[PDB]
Amino acid sequence: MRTLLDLDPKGKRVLVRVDYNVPVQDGKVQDETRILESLPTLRHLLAGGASLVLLSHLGRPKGPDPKYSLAPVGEALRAHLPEARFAPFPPGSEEARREAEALRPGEVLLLENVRFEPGEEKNDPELSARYARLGEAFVLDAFGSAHRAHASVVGVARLLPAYAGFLMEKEVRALSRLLKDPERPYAVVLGGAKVSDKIGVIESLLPRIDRLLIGGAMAFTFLKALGGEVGRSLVEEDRLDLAKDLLGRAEALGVRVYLPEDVVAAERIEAGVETRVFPARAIPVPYMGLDIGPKTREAFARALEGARTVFWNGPMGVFEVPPFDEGTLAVGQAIAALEGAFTVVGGGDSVAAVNRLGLKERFGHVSTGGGASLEFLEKGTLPGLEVLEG
Numbered sequence: 001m002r003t004l005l006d007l008d009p010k011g012k013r014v015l016v017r018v019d020y021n022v023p024v025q026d027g028k029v030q031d032e033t034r035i036l037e038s039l040p041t042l043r044h045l046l047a048g049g050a051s052l053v054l055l056s057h058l059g060r061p062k063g064p065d066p067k068y069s070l071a072p073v074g075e076a077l078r079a080h081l082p083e084a085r086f087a088p089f090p091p092g093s094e095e096a097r098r099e100a101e102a103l104r105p106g107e108v109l110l111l112e113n114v115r116f117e118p119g120e121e122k123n124d125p126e127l128s129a130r131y132a133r134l135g136e137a138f139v140l141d142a143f144g145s146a147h148r149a150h151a152s153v154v155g156v157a158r159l160l161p162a163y164a165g166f167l168m169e170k171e172v173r174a175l176s177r178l179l180k181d182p183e184r185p186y187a188v189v190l191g192g193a194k195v196s197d198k199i200g201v202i203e204s205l206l207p208r209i210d211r212l213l214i215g216g217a218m219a220f221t222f223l224k225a226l227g228g229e230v231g232r233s234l235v236e237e238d239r240l241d242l243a244k245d246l247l248g249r250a251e252a253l254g255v256r257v258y259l260p261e262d263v264v265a266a267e268r269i270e271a272g273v274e275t276r277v278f279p280a281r282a283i284p285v286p287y288m289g290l291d292i293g294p295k296t297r298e299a300f301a302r303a304l305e306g307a308r309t310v311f312w313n314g315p316m317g318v319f320e321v322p323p324f325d326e327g328t329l330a331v332g333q334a335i336a337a338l339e340g341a342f343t344v345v346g347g348g349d350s351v352a353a354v355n356r357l358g359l360k361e362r363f364g365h366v367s368t369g370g371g372a373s374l375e376f377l378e379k380g381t382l383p384g385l386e387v388l389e390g
């Protein structure tokens with residue numbers, strides 16, 4: 001993969017696809033972490049004598065939705081880079097082109113949300129050709145956008161010499177340690193409500209790991225297939241055979257699997273609702289398992305002892321509804337407490353859990369909040385990565 005130093009930025013206007021998809025409220029960025037993380041790439045290019053045009057998505061609006069304008073992000077960026085300016089013009093527009101052509105060495109221009117362009121998500125080749133007028137070289141520094149063939153990710157990269165920025169490279173390398181020669185014992189903790197959403201990553205990682213811990217509602221599909229009585233717990237009836245086959249593959253590959261022993265159940269998903277603890281294989285109707293129980297949390301933590309690599313993605317229960325978030329928080333706490341293990345966390349709820357444990361710095365790598373990381377682990381590559389090779 002072509003990396004940042006392969007580009008000679010001197011006297012060139014460089015187009016950079018960054019990830020500034022940050023939380024915004026009342027016209028103010030609520031967390032500028034993503035903006036800060038993009039700085040090394042920008043500083044390198046500016047020190048190299050280039051001018052910069054920045055492109056980013058914000059939310060997933062289908063067109064020019066003012067709620068998702070990058071204006072607030074431009075303000076936050078300028079506070080760190082005084083030479084940066086924001087222009088409220090879609091990147092495929094003639095106004096954007098003129099603004100970009102007027103830039104001088106050292107200047108930085110952030111254009112409007114790429115999602116405002118109708119051809120962006122369609123990877124419109126003509127739109128990509130217009131993006132190609134914005135710079136002489138292209139730097140992709142947004143791993144979280146690399147899983148989709150979009151005009152500002154793949155399309156323009158095919159018209160300009162393309163390179164991976166510092167951040168993009170860092171993310172790819174971290175996840176690559178979960179695919180190539182990972183340190184063993186290697187344990188994987190997967191959660192989520194449906195096994196169907198984990199089939200790809202499970203089949204991809206099974207031949208590479210030693211232990212697989214399964215939590216979340218998807219565990220009930222496995223448990224029912226194995227003969228357990230899960231009461232009114234969520235189950236994908238059309239995936240019962242598949243669940244059993246995945247366990248069969250684990251047995252064939254020498255991967256030890258762990259499933260819940262007990263669960264915290266309730267008659268309905270309600271915050272603070274009264275609960276009952278039942279064996280995961282004996283949940284009486286009308287109860288439904290909503291989180292892994294205390295014995296399961298303990299067992300899952302013990303299963304990680306000795307691991308040198310741990311990858312975790314997914315909630316252990318109904319994370320957004322207390323007290324059914326305890327299992328997820330407990331797994332995060334257990335992983336943070338490990339010694340001698342490279343730990344990687346991905347997934348919406350699990351990353352959210354890590355962010356409120358007050359132990360985030362304890363993890364080896366917390367992947368980009370999105371689906372790109374999981375797709376990369378399943379396929380071994382991404383569209384945005386392929387345009388940086390060759």
Ligand code: NA
Pocket residue numbers: 204205377378379380
């Ligand atoms: Na794979």
